[PDB]
Design a protein around this ligand. Structure first.
Ligand SMILES: Nc1nc2c(ncn2[C@@H]2O[C@H](COP(=O)(O)OP(=O)(O)OP(=O)(O)O)[C@@H](O)[C@H]2O)c(=O)[nH]1
Ligand SMILES: Nc1nc2c(ncn2[C@@H]2O[C@H](COP(=O)(O)OP(=O)(O)OP(=O)(O)O)[C@@H](O)[C@H]2O)c(=O)[nH]1
Ligand SMILES: [Mg+2]
Ligand SMILES: [Mg+2]
Lengths: 169, 172
């Protein structure tokens, strides 16, 4: 199975991203944590289902976060393109937290997700490129907007492919 | 060296994409074909020297297109999200033509680029997902907007990564 987990600082748009995918429409309001979302195996050529899991610090303990990290086989670290603090925390908090707990005999791909592209005129790539170069665990990066749905489809396609295309050609 | 070639139907935005990458501003006027671009290693996403080549049917012959395909080590097939014809030509023209190359001993990764995302509120993913499924030589896909400077840095990062770190399934 593909088991996707979204982590990242509060209010970067994790839940909104998941619920925008669900309804193909931006929800004006969201709960702290979305329900688990299922993509049936019919979608991928590998005939494998996808599960999408949300994390909310307001609702969940660090013990629960660690277990979610253990269950996931691809982790989207979400930041907001208009929030430097959320980007800083990718390297000061999220990557070390995940890496400390990953199986060193294996690989857990990470995807850097820059949400709220609808708010800004310029790219976050210049800022996140040095993070990419440092951590080969990061499989790819994407900028998107839950508000207008742009690149949301790509986001979860990339996450699936990080698991289903995990080696070379 | 990463050697990128942009192909695709007329007016999908190949030249505008390249010039928006260079200038970080959308050119309201573009020539038919950008001049060949050579970018130093330490200013590119993957830290390797990068060449970017533009194709223009009015400016170049079929022989020159054939030469450019053999020289590239990643090809971005550009379509316009609001032009179904430019999408149909991805499979009817561009992929077969690329597979006419003579030296097939090395994989030539492809990237599907849906430009002009500023014009529409829907994704082209449903349309191009069947293409991705049928043609495993396609490494990834991206939707961008030269006009709004969206996902242009991503596009060229994806292109470099296809050369240096191509991907594939666990089992064939
Ligand atoms: N403009 C804009 N606003 C967004 C976008 N995505 C989410 N928001 C807004 O950002 C705020 C936070 O969104 P959430 O989905 O609750 O973010 P979260 O990461 O789940 O927050 P926590 O659960 O507290 O960690 C809400 O007001 C959303 O409406 C976006 O893409 N663009
Ligand atoms: N709205 C919008 N228009 C674009 C975008 N990119 C290019 N255009 C416009 O599309 C037209 C064609 O752009 P070109 O860059 O000349 O496209 P091309 O693929 O190089 O065309 P040929 O060289 O003739 O094959 C021009 O009017 C551009 O201004 C875009 O991202 N959004
Ligand atoms: Mg939430
Ligand atoms: Mg041109």
């Amino acid at each position: 199975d593909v088991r996707i987990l979204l982590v990242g600082e509060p209010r970067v748009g994790k839940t909104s991203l998941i619920m925008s995918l669900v309804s193909e429409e931006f929800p004006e309001e969201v709960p702290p944590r979305a329900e688990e979302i299922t993509i049936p195996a019919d979608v991928t050529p590998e005939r494998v289902p996808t599960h999408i899991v949300d994390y909310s610090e307001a609702e969940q303990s660090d013990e629960q976060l660690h277990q979610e990290i253990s269950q996931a086989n691809v982790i989207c670290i979400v930041y907001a393109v208009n929030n430097k603090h959320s980007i800083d925390k990718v390297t000061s908090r999220w990557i070390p937290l995940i890496n400390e707990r990953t199986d060193k005999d294996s690989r857990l791909p990470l995807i850097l997700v820059g949400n709220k592209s609808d708010l800004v005129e310029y790219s976050s790539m210049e800022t996140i490129l040095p993070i990419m170069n440092q951590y080969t665990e990061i499989e790819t990066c994407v900028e998107c907007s839950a508000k207008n749905l742009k690149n949301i489809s790509e986001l979860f396609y990339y996450a699936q492919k990080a698991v289903l295309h995990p080696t070379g050609p």
